Design a protein around this ligand. Sequence first.
Ligand SMILES: OC[C@H]1O[C@@](CO)(O[C@H]2O[C@H](CO)[C@@H](O)[C@H](O)[C@H]2O)[C@@H](O)[C@@H]1O
Ligand SMILES: OC[C@H]1O[C@@](CO)(O[C@H]2O[C@H](CO)[C@@H](O)[C@H](O)[C@H]2O)[C@@H](O)[C@@H]1O
Ligand SMILES: [Mg+2]
Length: 580
Amino acid sequence: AKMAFTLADRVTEEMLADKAALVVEVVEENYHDAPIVGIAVVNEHGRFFLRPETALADPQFVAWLGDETKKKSMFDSKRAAVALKWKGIELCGVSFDLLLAAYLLDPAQGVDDVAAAAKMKQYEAVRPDEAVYGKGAKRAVPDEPVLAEHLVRKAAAIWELERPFLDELRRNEQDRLLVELEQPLSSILAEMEFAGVKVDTKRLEQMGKELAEQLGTVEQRIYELAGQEFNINSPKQLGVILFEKLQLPVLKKTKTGYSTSADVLEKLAPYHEIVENILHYRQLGKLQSTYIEGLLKVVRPDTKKVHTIFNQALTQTGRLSSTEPNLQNIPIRLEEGRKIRQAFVPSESDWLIFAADYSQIELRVLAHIAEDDNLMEAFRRDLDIHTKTAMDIFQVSEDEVTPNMRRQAKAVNFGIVYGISDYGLAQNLNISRKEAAEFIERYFESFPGVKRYMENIVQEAKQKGYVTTLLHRRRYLPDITSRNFNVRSFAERMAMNTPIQGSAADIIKKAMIDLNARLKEERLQAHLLLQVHDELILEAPKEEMERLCRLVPEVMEQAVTLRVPLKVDYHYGSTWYDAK
DNA sequence: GCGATCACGCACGTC
DNA sequence: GACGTACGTGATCGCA
Ligand SMILES: OC[C@H]1O[C@@](CO)(O[C@H]2O[C@H](CO)[C@@H](O)[C@H](O)[C@H]2O)[C@@H](O)[C@@H]1O
Ligand SMILES: OC[C@H]1O[C@@](CO)(O[C@H]2O[C@H](CO)[C@@H](O)[C@H](O)[C@H]2O)[C@@H](O)[C@@H]1O
Ligand SMILES: [Mg+2]
């Protein structure tokens, strides 16, 4: 049965009530400078559809959008807020975001439209967006009657579902997590995305040119060494060259053929000079295709900025992700790739990039949650944690810790945080399962509080059905009761890891909210550009650097109070590369 | 049948 | 442990 609404030709006062469900529809996946295709409002007075050209040109409607005392409930308010920012319109007063509510209640549902959220509460009187707009290439905005009914049904669902969602959040003790953390964060991310990051495209193009020259040389050397020409980028052609023509050992298999992962190739390098060249080719080609060509494709040519979109409602642990471009995986480990960061520059003359990162936040969170006396003392002394771990597991003095010992202890520390397993550690360190098991046993002997946490958290996951983070984010783990060893073991590792990774995510999100409040109080021009899981990147006038050196680390260190200190390192410079 | 698209396995970049 | 993008390849679709 059809849903009744007014297809309005002009904005009226009853559309401007002080509580409403609002839909401001942006169909393009990337909403930056994208069209708004229609607007729906549902409130005490009825249901309304407005054409955007009309509504967004109407002073009363625009004033209503920007009035913080006029409360709106929405789904994915950041998309609307950013699309409106590109049109110079402020959206304020969003008091409920159904996307973030659904995400907090259960991130595993993968809710990404109103219909998916609605089905959580047995409400089905709204179509999935994919049904209305189609998917992929065939995607398209439908004719007005179809569009208007869809937007009004979405607004009506939001209007109905706010109360039951808030009720369930309150039962879970997650209502403050929504209202005081995720919703305010959404506004901060909207500002970050809209500001964008300035790119030195000439520098990127120069790099592109160098890389292409190097790739040509290496490509030709590979042909020479192979005694043949082939698609180095093909798994089938390369496999025939390495494991048939050149007879290299097959040390590892993939589902459907020969593994050629770098870890495998590293092992084969002693047998034939072609291998080191394939590795080099892959290094350069990744930089060329993903970073140089990829970034240049998405830079806006007018302003030379890139505008990422942070997906706030995707990861199972409460981290953000970043897309189009992903600015959370710009190279840093190897110097050649690291130079890519020289192309990320401040957006104004005489400004600088300032970067601040937490030192070992996940192990500090683990020390806190596990109340492990040895680990807490280590951080209270601000020790090098990997050297301390080596001292304990290998039973030696600090002087006797060799580089290889520190390297292996570091890998153990990562294993412990990720959800230790003897097979996984063995693969990482390239040792036997028995040997890896001995490393883990020694670790738990030195850190018995961590051992107790790991046992207890798996038991809690089984008993309650989920694990929780410091600020009450939850992750359900139904596979924890599986009678399949591999399925169950993966869930156990999630039970161990999620409260650590997720609590670290909670802390940095709170730090962002606190930082923006402090920046506004101090009336600094500095602002956030990016978050990369445990680090915040800002730009500001050079004259603000001294103040930021004190202000940013303090805010990040004081965001929460743990049983150990939090420690933040910081650097600044004329490009992201130099903020090291 | 011939591009256009979709789907998936794979490899590799970050924290 | 958590992500996103690029690529090659084979399948499928879209329309005659
Ligand atoms: O707008 C972000 C918000 O939208 C969702 C879908 O509800 O993701 C869409 O937007 C993305 C960013 O452009 C795409 O990466 C994604 O493919 C698209 O479905 C949410 O998942 C997200 O939180
Ligand atoms: O032997 C106990 C030890 O095994 C683990 C897995 O490493 O859990 C297993 O043992 C349980 C009972 O004590 C089950 O509840 C669990 O499902 C099973 O996998 C550890 O958590 C536990 O300490
Ligand atoms: Mg760090």
